[PDB]
Amino acid sequence: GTVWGALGHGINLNIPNFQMTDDIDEVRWERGSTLVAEFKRKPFLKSGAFEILANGDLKIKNLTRDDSGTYNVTVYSTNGTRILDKALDLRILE
Amino acid sequence: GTVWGALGHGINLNIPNFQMTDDIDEVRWERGSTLVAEFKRKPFLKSGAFEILANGDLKIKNLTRDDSGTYNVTVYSTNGTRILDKALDLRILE
Numbered sequence: 248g249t250v251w252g253a254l255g256h257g258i259n260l261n262i263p264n265f266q267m268t269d270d271i272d273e274v275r276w277e278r279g280s281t282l283v284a285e286f287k288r289k290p291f292l293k294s295g296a297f298e299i300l301a302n303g304d305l306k307i308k309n310l311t312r313d314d315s316g317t318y319n320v321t322v323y324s325t326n327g328t329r330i331l332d333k334a335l336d337l338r339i340l341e
Numbered sequence: 342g343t344v345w346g347a348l349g350h351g352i353n354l355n356i357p358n359f360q361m362t363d364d365i366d367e368v369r370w371e372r373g374s375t376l377v378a379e380f381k382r383k384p385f386l387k388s389g390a391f392e393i394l395a396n397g398d399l400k401i402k403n404l405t406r407d408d409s410g411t412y413n414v415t416v417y418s419t420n421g422t423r424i425l426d427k428a429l430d431l432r433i434l435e
Contacts, residue, residue, distance in 0.1 A: 248427075248429055248430070249429075249430045249432060250429050250430065250431050250432070251431075251432055251433075251434060252401070252404045252408070252409070252431055252432070252433045252434070253404065253433060253434040253435075254404055254405065254406070254433060254434065254435050255403065255404065256403075256404050257400065257401065257402050257403060257404065258400070258401050258404060258431070259394070259398050259399070259400050260398060260399040260400075260401070260412055260414075260429050260431060261398050262396070262397055262398060262414050262416065262425065262427065263427045263429070265396075265397070265416065265425060266396075267395065267396040267397055269419075270418050270419050271397070271416060271417070271418060271419070271424070272417050272418060272419045272420075272421060273415075273416065273417040274393065274397035274414070274415075274416050274417075275414065275415045275416075275417075276393065276399045276412060276413070276414055277412070277413045277415075278410055278411070278412050278413075279410070279411070281387065282385065282387065283386075283387050283391055283399065283412065284384060284385060284386050284387065284391050284392070284393040284399055285384060285385040285393070286384045286385075286393050286397065287381065289419070290378060290379060290380040290381075291376060291378060291379040291380075292377075292378050293375065293376065293377050293378070297377060297378055298378075299368065299370065299378040299379070299380050300353065301361065302356070302360070302361040303356050303359070303361055303365070303368035303380065304353045304354060304355050304356055305353065305354040305370045305377065305378055306351065306352070306353045306354075307346070307351060307352050307353075307354070308351045309349065309350075309351060310346045310347065310348055310349065310350055310351065310352060311348070312348070314346065315346070316372055316373070317372070317373075318354055318370060318371070318372050318377065319370070319371045319372075320354075320356050320357075320368065320369065320370055321367075321368075321369045321371075322356065322359065322365060322367065322368050322369075323365070323366045323367040323368075323369075324364050324365060324366060325363075325364045325365065325366045325382070325383070326366070327366060330365075331356070331359060333356065333357045335342075335343075335344055335354050335357070336342060336343040336344070337343070337344050337345075337346055337352075337354060338343055338344070338345050338346065339345070339346040339347065339348060340345060340346065340347040340348065341348050
């Protein structure tokens with residue numbers, strides 16, 4: 248579809264034939280290679296072997312030798328400021 | 342510094358000296374170049390000239406010539422299933 252805007256004015260690009268519900272995890276808007284806006288309710292998780300807790304802690308379900316190594320955590324405040332950055336060396340008893 | 346895990350057991354990597362408050366936008370866990378987990382409350386927005394509405398529509402606040410072109414929208418359901426993928430051709434009258 249084609250949408251018309253005009254200089255100096257604002258505009259809302261409406262998602263064609265769609266209704267927002269709770270069964271929606273993400274809405275992504277891109278313009279070519281540019282990511283313009285993105286909404287994502289559930290956290291990103293590499294796999295089910297992991298889960299991020301309420302407090303922000305990382306839970307690893309079943310440890311294997313592959314899980315050892317250095318993990319980096321970064322925390323950003325509501326305004327985007329990087330308030331924390333720590334490296335956590337996870338070693339595994341075998 | 343280092344946390345110890347045991348083969349076959351699970352573990353919570355605790356963020357060093359930190360308590361979760363409402364002033365936290367993002368918590369990111371990485372392992373090398375791998376993104377392990379990520380939580381982000383606020384949407385991603387290229388700039389203040391944009392905002393994503395509740396329904397998922399894209400609001401471009403002030404239209405300029407450089408805002409015209411094709412915008413691709415992609416919506417995913419809760420289980421990551423791509424439920425929609427449209428493209429709007431935004432043309433701007435000068």
